[PDB]
Ligand binder design. Structure first.
Ligand SMILES: *[C@H](O)[C@H](C[C@@H]1CCNC1=O)NC(=O)[C@H](CC(C)C)NC(=O)OCC(C)(C)[S@](=O)c1ccccc1
Ligand SMILES: *[C@H](O)[C@H](C[C@@H]1CCNC1=O)NC(=O)[C@H](CC(C)C)NC(=O)OCC(C)(C)[S@](=O)c1ccccc1
Lengths: 306, 306
């Protein structure tokens, strides 16, 4: 029995129309063209045998507007003339002389651990695929990015408004990925330089495991639901010792509780038991806890509620 | 060590520009607008009280061009005038007075069990999400579709050409989904009416399990590799006895064998052993075989090879 859950990304067309290629001398990567601004990772400025210890302030000083070439390859091709350049945290803001005619309604936001967003993977300014990820508690994502992908963007959508939340920067030793918010900060404690980096411990996202257990009930799978309950406060003390995030309820979770008639506290107890072992049983085809679906995923994909 | 594998869909913008809403009487769903043709499921023609045993030839004869209402909602909205109608298998072909100005280069193709394709899920002619699935051996997909999703489309891409392969029609009792190819045949033995239907046994897709074991080896996870080999002929006899598809090697699998230095027959042996149990161990974070990634997925996402 299929749960009805897939990894569901937003349609990417609106964001595709904003991707460009940014070249600075010998270096190239992707950028995001919104209004008269092109955003891209600042390490496009850095020579290859220097990424280990760059001085981004000096590199920026050494650049002129003609140092940056910006090209739109898809749709109607364009070459964009740069008329200003500036740095914000780990991003460059290049000002161009033409406003993107396809600029969507947009905002910038930061995504939080456990929340899902859509990524448009791009190479040389050309979109190549789209996928969705949850931001991990250690501020990495389990993505799919190769050489040339930097500047690929992540986003959520609220109505027609695109909320850009991620610009890809790097791959860690363990194969996971991280990047910047559009305020220029790196997610977590990461730094955009070519050095091995202390990468922190991941955790199970409790609110997402609860959502997934609700998805199981909505599919008629509820062998793990007992009358026993664990309070949110007690679960959260337990979570601290057992590699779970602390549970914070939301209206989205509340709607799942009302729909199923199963209280959050019943599922907090269930998680504590399932963490010790599934004892030969399965839930939605799995023998381990699933934390990659959000409460909003379950409400949208199974009940059609946004 | 995250494998670097995600469910990767194609960028959806080219297909978004082809989706329309099709309404017939009080029935509504999605259609695909290419050149002067709108494709949609023929059951839009059926009253809801009659979906169990529709007389589609008689329904078609009763329609006029004015029976159909076609709207483009996204981008530049338009109301399309139907100027001819025809039935092909389980699809309607509506001829409209306007050629879609955003028609991409396209073909129609049929997808085979084990192959992946991208789906653009739509409601009321408006794209809402994109995801990727593999066609199962029983000609269903494990999708995410609600009421109103019919006419959502699936496709692959070669270069800039979109190969349309799927139009969504129905959800089965076990939560899986099926639909039509654009020659109007249903996938599998399914029929487009509201009657509960014999849905056949699924199988593990051996070629995809082989791909996933190669992904593990590429990631440094090769504890299951031994000198022991099972020939394709011998594996295929075993596959028929153990709910696996028969293995047919491809050039894509061959390049994984070259890159890892592990022969196909070593992994066929590994699958036989792993199927009897992982013995408490994991592969790429899993305690069961994974068959939802293709050889092409592994070549593309891990080695950057289209
Ligand atoms: C930009 O396109 C690129 C994206 C990477 C390339 C491989 N996959 C990706 O997602 N970013 C970088 O290569 C990045 C540039 C820095 C200046 C930000 N470096 C990077 O990701 O290097 C990996 C590290 C940071 C050295 S990580 O600590 C590591 C150590 C040892 C082995 C592997 C990885
Ligand atoms: C078209 O929008 C719609 C899509 C469905 C609705 C729910 N999720 C979907 O994917 N298709 C239909 O409703 C379809 C119309 C027929 C004329 C093809 N019927 C449908 O999906 O019915 C399900 C059956 C055929 C009754 S299946 O045998 C079943 C039996 C028992 C429980 C559930 C499903």
């Amino acid at each position: 029995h299929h749960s009805g859950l897939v990894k569901m990304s937003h349609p990417s067309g609106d964001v595709e129309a904003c991707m460009v290629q940014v070249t600075c001398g010998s270096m190239t990567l992707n950028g995001l063209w919104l209004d008269n601004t092109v955003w891209c990772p600042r390490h496009v400025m850095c020579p290859a045998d220097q990424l280990s210890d760059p001085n981004y302030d000096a590199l920026l000083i050494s650049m002129t507007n003609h140092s940056f070439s910006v090209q739109k390859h898809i749709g109607a091709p364009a070459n964009l003339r740069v008329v200003g350049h500036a740095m914000q945290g780990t991003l460059l803001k290049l000002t161009v002389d033409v406003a993107n005619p396809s600029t969507p309604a947009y905002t910038f936001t930061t995504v939080k651990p456990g929340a899902a967003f859509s990524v448009l993977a791009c190479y040389n300014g050309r979109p190549t695929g789209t996928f969705t990820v949850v931001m991990r508690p250690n501020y990495t994502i389990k993505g799919s990015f190769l050489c040339g992908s930097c500047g690929s963007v992540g986003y959520t959508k609220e109505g027609s408004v695109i909320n850009f939340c991620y610009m890809h920067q790097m791959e860690l030793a363990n194969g996971t990925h991280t990047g910047s918010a559009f305020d220029g900060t790196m997610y977590g404690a990461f730094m955009d330089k070519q050095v091995h980096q202390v990468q922190l411990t991941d955790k199970y996202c409790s609110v997402n495991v609860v959502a997934w257990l609700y998805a199981a009930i909505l599919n008629g799978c509820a062998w793990f639901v007992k009358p026993n309950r664990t309070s949110v406060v007690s679960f959260n003390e337990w979570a601290l010792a057992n590699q779970f995030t602390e549970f914070v309820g939301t209206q989205s979770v509340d709607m799942l509780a009302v729909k199923t008639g199963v209280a959050i506290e019943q599922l907090l107890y269930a998680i504590q038991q399932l963490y010790t072992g599934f004892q030969g049983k399965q839930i939605l085809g799995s023998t381990m806890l699933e934390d990659e679906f959000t409460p909003e995923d379950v409400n949208m994909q199974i009940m059609g509620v946004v």
